[PDB]
Amino acid sequence: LTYFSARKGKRKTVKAVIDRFLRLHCGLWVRRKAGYKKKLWKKTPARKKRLREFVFCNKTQSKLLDKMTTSFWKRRNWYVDDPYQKYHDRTNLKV
Amino acid sequence: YRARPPPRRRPGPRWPDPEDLLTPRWQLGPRYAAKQFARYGAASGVVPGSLWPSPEQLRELEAEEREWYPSLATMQESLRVKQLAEEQKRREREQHIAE
Amino acid sequence: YPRFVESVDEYQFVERLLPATRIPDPPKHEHYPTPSGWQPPRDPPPNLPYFVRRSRMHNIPVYKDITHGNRQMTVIRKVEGDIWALQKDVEDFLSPLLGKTPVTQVNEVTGTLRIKGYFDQELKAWLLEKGF
Amino acid sequence: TVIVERWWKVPLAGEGRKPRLHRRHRVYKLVEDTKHRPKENLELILTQSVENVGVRGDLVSVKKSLGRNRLLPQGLAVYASPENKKLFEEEKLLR
Amino acid sequence: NFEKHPKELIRGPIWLRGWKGNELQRCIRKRKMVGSRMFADDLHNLNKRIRYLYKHFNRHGKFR
Amino acid sequence: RLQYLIDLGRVDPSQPIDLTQLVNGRGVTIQPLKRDYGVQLVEEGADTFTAKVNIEVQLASELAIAAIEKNGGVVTTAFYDPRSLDIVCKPVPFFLRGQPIPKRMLPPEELVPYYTDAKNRGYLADPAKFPEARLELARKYGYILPDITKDELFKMLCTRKDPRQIFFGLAPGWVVNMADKKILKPTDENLLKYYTS
Amino acid sequence: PLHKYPVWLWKRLQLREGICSRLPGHYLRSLEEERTPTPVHYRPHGAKFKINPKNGQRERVEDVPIPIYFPPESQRGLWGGEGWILGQIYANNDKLSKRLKKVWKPQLFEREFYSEILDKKFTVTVTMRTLDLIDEAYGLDFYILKTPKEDLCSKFGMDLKRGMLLRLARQDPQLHPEDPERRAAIYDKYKEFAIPEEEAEWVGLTLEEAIEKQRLLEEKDPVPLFKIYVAELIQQLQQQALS
RNA sequence: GCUAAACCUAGCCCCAAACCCACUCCACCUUACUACCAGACAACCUUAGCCAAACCAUUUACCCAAAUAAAGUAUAGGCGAUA
RNA sequence: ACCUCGGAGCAGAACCCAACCUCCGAGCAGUACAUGCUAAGACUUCACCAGUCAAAGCGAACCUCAAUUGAUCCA
Ligand SMILES: [Mg+2]
Ligand SMILES: [Mg+2]
Ligand SMILES: [Mg+2]
Ligand SMILES: [Mg+2]
């Protein structure tokens, strides 16, 4: 997507994925499940909590989002009071 | 063959012709003078006193910093007022729920 | 224009601010092993068919690598001399841990070893107790 | 003299360079026509005395229509300028 | 003693001095740097080239 | 890592440790354009630590503070602007520009409580309360509190910079020159009062 | 191949080399001023930096002038610091609608204007803004002499500027027959706007008529070679008689 | 064996640097290259669109004044493409 | 004529299986208001989107039906 720009000749990010998702330096992505703020009255508590809970993205669409956005969003960042410092790294992973 | 002499930079500052259009304007600007001074020492012939800002920029910078960058007393009293208002909100809401 | 009075006495702080360009050889600590697990190389070195040099930062040239995301290896970078005695030695050292002889790969051109599995801590401890 | 503002935002440019433009910036929007704005009477000093307005040396606020139409062209009244109000006050003190 | 970098050694165009790039990058650099000194037909066909190459590199090929 | 540094001997504990000294020892690279307002102290490595240094920092964890105070060192937090931090971590190019050293700014609308708190060793906080915080840290982590007033290098250990100053030797308004090495003051009352303000 | 200079330099290069090269420096400076006009068709931001309501951080802002179109009748008759606005707009101020070609034309008025310095009343097409700004300037001649060339943007206005400055620098009795006291009073009122005679002559002129005036001044019959030879021969004969 | 075949020059392309042009024998705006008579006649205006958006209707980079970097970040946007 | 979802046969016995194939339906309703919060492990309408079951703990007492329905932006 926009593999070369006319002003600098570089790749360009779509702000959509940035506003929708979040990348962890492990290579993973997370997302808020659809429909967590819609028609809650008919949805049962279990369903609505399943919708509230975050979730990851499989490898195909992970790699897709990676190709869509650029490296600035893949770099390591040291935020303050950001609860995801525990998740930007991976632990005890084989195979 | 004798090898050509090795390429060396132009010794001493490089003061371009000001009445020459293709020469950029950022050389004629004062910042280039400061760079040349700090690079080639006092040999540049540039006056040292020109490095510091004139009283015009002095007053402009003073005004803008007074306007945007507050003082420690103002900062601390603002924080005090904020925390006092938050305490008031907490107290009134909790006593309302209590009654 | 400003009066602009001059001084030179406060230049010591300036050349303190100025950085260096060569790694300073570390001081001679009265007691080793130095904290943080640092240990200088023994001198005189051991007379052997080979030898292992340190890096710029006076560390051991053992390193790691991950390839394809799953291949999980160590490497020895800059061994001088007979690499084959050394690969035999590491094989004899690491065979009992796995029950199998390692599958090392030697590039005697650059003098590098490339070995399966992570063993960096044991490798560096072995090289230290030999004093390279 | 109608006033307008750009519907789109202009990309910021340096003080030494002009800004880049585009038809997306050529598009405009009206804000105020400055003719429907309410009128504020202007101050003037009358030399000759007229009905219901004032007398010699007297200053008063009147309508732009009247002033531009009959007072100023006829040469009766003059503007309240710091050069002439001075002598008006001086002759007032004299009287 | 690092008094000069070898990239200022090469004698050549002003927009090709210690820099590499494909067609798009080269044409944009040309028009940005020395574009005002270009002749009419040259700048015209350069802009046409970068327009064609924009839409080519961005729309055409495999891997999309 | 700090123990590793002081053991390798590239950073000298004999002098006050500062962020510029860290960057010149290559202990940490910095990216001020990437809006990193400074450096944090990490709990990791509290054990096997015998530095005794007078470390200056921006952010500090209570465990690191306790460890360094047990070893006898000194902690000081000091907020920096983005441009102030970039000129700090690479001072030489600024000197190649030759402009006068700008004065630091005070913390923004949110960091003032932190940098004024004494538990966090705020350079705004009073010295009268630092003994108290040291006492509570010792009483918590169960280690005696070694008073540093006796050692010969208490001077070095308590050397600190006042606000609106970058380096211990230099101050704002000062100008430095390397070629024909010299240092310059304006000696104009207006500039002096400003740079002191 | 490429040019030595860019294209946008060629105008001032002609200005520096040619008949215009002999022009006086002050006129060249007035040409090469590039002074900003007073904004009429947009309220400029009060400051260079501003805190937007979205996020609580600083943002630099720079006003942007509108490309006003000034027909020739505006130059013929003083309108003011305004003119026809060309542009596009959306129907019913909705982005999600069709763009359309809009034009704004200010309301003109045929009005009288008298100046005691020139001693004549003119009929001109003007605007409410023109009237308001002359009123706040507290006098017509005051406005004309006080106004920035670009804010005036009227050839008629600059011609009046030229005439008034010429008369003030000349101190002519041509204006006031048998009224020297009124002459002196008015010249004392307008003394501070005065400038040199040559300056008042050159001001208010585009490059074409400037070079035309310069050509008319430089133009003359060339002196005969016969005459200059007679002169130099008389000089030589004086020298020989001396020796 | 014919038709044929072969050649190597004219010259040209990209750059760099450098700024550049005019018989001054006659004629040439009327039907141009035509020796010679009363007219009052003069310019100053958004580029649009294809195409992409898998239709299309808001929108869709095209320089205008230092190379690199900050940064394809802040931002804008049928918050989509994209800028 | 149809365009979504569900049940039955074709598809008889773990799963899946089409036709402008053969039949019946749905686009709600009723009762509570802990129809509260959190959590191991698993299924999954052949992808994704979605859709499902739920141990345990806190805090409390002492849901039925078969489909019974709708993404993002935006307001
Ligand atoms: Mg590798
Ligand atoms: Mg359109
Ligand atoms: Mg599935
Ligand atoms: Mg339960």
What does the alpha-carbon distance between residue F181 and residue C7 come to, in Å, rounded to a whole number? 10
What does the alpha-carbon distance between residue F109 and residue B75 come to, in Å, rounded to a whole number? 7
Residues G152, G158: contact at Cβ < 8 Å? yes
The domain total for chain G is: 1
What does the alpha-carbon distance between residue C112 and residue C120 come to, in Å, rounded to a whole number? 14
* C-alpha pair distances (Å), C81 with each of C56, C61, C112, G97: 20, 15, 11, 79
What does DSSP assign to residue D71? I
What does DSSP assign to residue D44? E
Residues 6 or more apart from F83 whose CB is under 8 A from it? F32, F102
What does the alpha-carbon distance between residue B35 and residue E9 come to, in Å, rounded to a whole number? 24
Residues G102, G88: contact at Cβ < 8 Å? yes
Q: Is the CB of A38 under 7 A from strand I?
A: yes
Q: Is the CB of A30 under 7 A from strand I?
A: no
Residues G154, G106: contact at Cβ < 8 Å? no
What does the alpha-carbon distance between residue F38 and residue F23 come to, in Å, rounded to a whole number? 11
Residues A57, A21: contact at Cβ < 8 Å? yes
Experimental resolution (Å): 4.0
Q: Which long-range contacts (CB under 8 A, 24 or more apart) does F125-131 make?
A: none
Nearest CA-CA partner of F185 in B8, C5, C84 = C5
Q: Which bases on strand H have an atom closer than 7 Å to a protein beta carbon?
A: 14-20, 44-48, 51-52, 57-83
Find the residue closest to H68 using CA and C1' atoms: E19
Residues 6 or more apart from A72 whose CB is under 8 A from it? A13
What does DSSP assign to residue A29? E
Interface membership of G10 toward E (CB under 8 Å): no
For residue D39 the two structure tokens come to: 């009128």
The residues pairing with G164 across neighbouring beta strands, listed in sequence order, are: none
Minimum-distance CB partner of F7 among C6, C23, C35: C35
What does the alpha-carbon distance between residue B94 and residue C101 come to, in Å, rounded to a whole number? 72
Residues C47, C104: contact at Cβ < 8 Å? no
For residue G133 the two structure tokens come to: 């700004």
Q: What is the dihedral of CA E51, E55, E57, E63, to 10 degrees?
A: 180
Minimum-distance CB partner of F190 among B37, B55, B69: B55
For residue G195 the two structure tokens come to: 């400038």
**What Rg, from alpha-carbon coordinates, does chain G have?**
26
Alpha helices in chain B, H assignment, sequence order: 25-28, 30-40, 55-68, 72-98
Helix (H, G, I), strand (E, B) or coil at C31: coil
Q: Which bases on strand I have an atom closer than 7 Å to a protein beta carbon?
A: 35-39, 48-54, 69-72
C92-103 per-residue burial string, b: 16 or more CB within 10 A, e: under 16: eebeeeeeeebe
Helix (H, G, I), strand (E, B) or coil at B60: helix
E39-63 per-residue burial string, b: 16 or more CB within 10 A, e: under 16: eeeebeebeeebeebbeebbeeeee
Measured between CA atoms, the residue of chain F closest to residue C29 is F7
What does the alpha-carbon distance between residue F89 and residue F83 come to, in Å, rounded to a whole number? 10
Alpha helices in G66-206, H assignment, sequence order: 72-76, 128-137, 140-146, 149-152, 155-170, 180-189, 197-202
Ligand 1 centroid to residue G226 C-alpha, Å: 95
List phi, psi (to 5°) of A11.
-70, 165
Task: Please give the helix or strand (H or E) that residue A67 lies within, else none.
Answer: helix A59-68
Ligand 1 centroid to residue C76 C-alpha, Å: 13
What does the alpha-carbon distance between residue C52 and residue C83 come to, in Å, rounded to a whole number? 10
What does the alpha-carbon distance between residue F82 and residue F36 come to, in Å, rounded to a whole number? 8
Interface membership of G51 toward B (CB under 8 Å): no
Ligand 2 centroid to residue A19 C-alpha, Å: 28
Residue listed under structure tokens 């630590």: F49
What does the alpha-carbon distance between residue B27 and residue B18 come to, in Å, rounded to a whole number? 9
What does DSSP assign to residue D54? B
F142-174 per-residue burial string, b: 16 or more CB within 10 A, e: under 16: eeeeeebeeeeeeeebeeebeebbbbbbbbbbb
In A5-34, the residues whose Cβ lies within 8 Å of chain E are 6-9
C chain contacts of residue B52, beta-carbon cutoff 8 Å: 2, 4
What does DSSP assign to residue D10? P
Residues A74, A56: contact at Cβ < 8 Å? no
* C-alpha pair distances (Å), G19 with each of A52, G7, G16, G24: 80, 20, 9, 11
Q: Is the CB of A19 under 7 A from strand H?
A: yes
Beta strand D42-46 pairing with D77-79: antiparallel
What does the alpha-carbon distance between residue G146 and residue G158 come to, in Å, rounded to a whole number? 12
In the structure, how far is the CA atom of residue A37 from the C1' atom of nucleotide I75, in angstroms?
15
Residues F166, F88: contact at Cβ < 8 Å? yes
Helix (H, G, I), strand (E, B) or coil at F186: coil
Measured between CA atoms, the residue of chain F closest to residue C57 is F8
Minimum-distance CB partner of D27 among G89, G114, G121: G89
What does the alpha-carbon distance between residue G98 and residue G96 come to, in Å, rounded to a whole number? 7
Output helix, strand, coil percentages for chain F, rounded to the nearest 5. Answer: 40, 10, 55
Q: Render chain E in DSSP notation, one character per residue.
A: --SS-GGGTS-S-SS-SS----HHHHHHHHHHHHGGGS-HHHHHHHHHHHHHHHHHHHHSSS--
Q: Report the sign of the C-alpha dihedral through residues G9, G15, G16, G19, in that order.
A: positive
Minimum-distance CB partner of A3 among E25, E28, E58: E58
* C-alpha pair distances (Å), C99 with each of C30, C93, G136: 41, 11, 101
**What Rg, from alpha-carbon coordinates, does chain A have?**
17
Q: Is the CB of A54 under 7 A from strand I?
A: no
Interface membership of B13 toward F (CB under 8 Å): no
Secondary structure of C68-118 in the HEC alphabet?
CCCEEEEEECCEEECHHHHHHHHHHHHHHHHCCCCCCEEECCCCEEEEECC
In the structure, how far is the CA atom of residue A45 from the C1' atom of nucleotide I36, in angstroms?
9
For residue F68 the two structure tokens come to: 């360094």
Residues F51, F6: contact at Cβ < 8 Å? yes
- Order across the sheet with D58-62: list the strands: D58-62, D42-46, D77-79
Beta strand G49-51 pairing with G58-60: antiparallel
What does the alpha-carbon distance between residue F136 and residue B81 come to, in Å, rounded to a whole number? 29
Residues 6 or more apart from D53 whose CB is under 8 A from it? D46, D60, D62
Ligand 3 centroid to residue G131 C-alpha, Å: 78
Nearest CA-CA partner of A74 in A63, A82, A83 = A63
For residue B20 the two structure tokens come to: 């020459």
What does the alpha-carbon distance between residue G7 and residue E37 come to, in Å, rounded to a whole number? 7
Beta strand G85-90 pairing with G99-104: antiparallel
Nearest ligand to the C-alpha of residue G99? 2
Nearest CA-CA partner of A35 in A64, A63, A55, A60 = A55
Residues F5, F74: contact at Cβ < 8 Å? no
Beta strand F74-77 pairing with F175-177: unpaired
Nearest ligand to the C-alpha of residue A58? 3
Between chains, do C4 and F185 touch, taking CB under 8 Å as contact? yes
Burial of G155 (0-12, 13-18, 19+ CB in 10 A): middle
Residues G77, G125: contact at Cβ < 8 Å? yes
What does the alpha-carbon distance between residue D60 and residue D52 come to, in Å, rounded to a whole number? 11
Residues C104, C114: contact at Cβ < 8 Å? yes
What does the alpha-carbon distance between residue D54 and residue D46 come to, in Å, rounded to a whole number? 7
* C-alpha pair distances (Å), G163 with each of F161, G146, G166, G181: 67, 14, 5, 21
| Method by which this entry was solved | cryo-EM
Q: Could you tell me how many residues make up chain F?
A: 197
Give the other-Cβ count within 10 Å of C113's Cβ: 23
Strands (E), chain D: 3-6, 28-32, 42-46, 58-62, 77-79
Measured between CA atoms, the residue of chain E closest to residue G8 is E36
Measured between CA atoms, the residue of chain B closest to residue F189 is B55
In the structure, how far is the CA atom of residue G83 from the C1' atom of nucleotide H49, in angstroms?
30
What does the alpha-carbon distance between residue D22 and residue C132 come to, in Å, rounded to a whole number? 68
Between chains, do B35 and F96 touch, taking CB under 8 Å as contact? yes
Q: Is the CB of A10 under 7 A from strand H?
A: yes
Beta strand F54-57 pairing with F74-77: parallel
Measured between CA atoms, the residue of chain G closest to residue E33 is G6
- Structural domain that includes position G17: 1-243
Hey, what amino acid is at G76? R
Domain architecture of chain C: domains with CATH? 4-132 (3.30.780.10)
What does the alpha-carbon distance between residue G159 and residue G165 come to, in Å, rounded to a whole number? 10
- Taking each helix axis from N to C terminus, what angle separates F189-196 and B55-68, rounded to the nearest 10 degrees? 20
Q: With left for phi above 0 and alpha for psi between -120 and 50, is residue F57 left, alpha or beta? A: beta
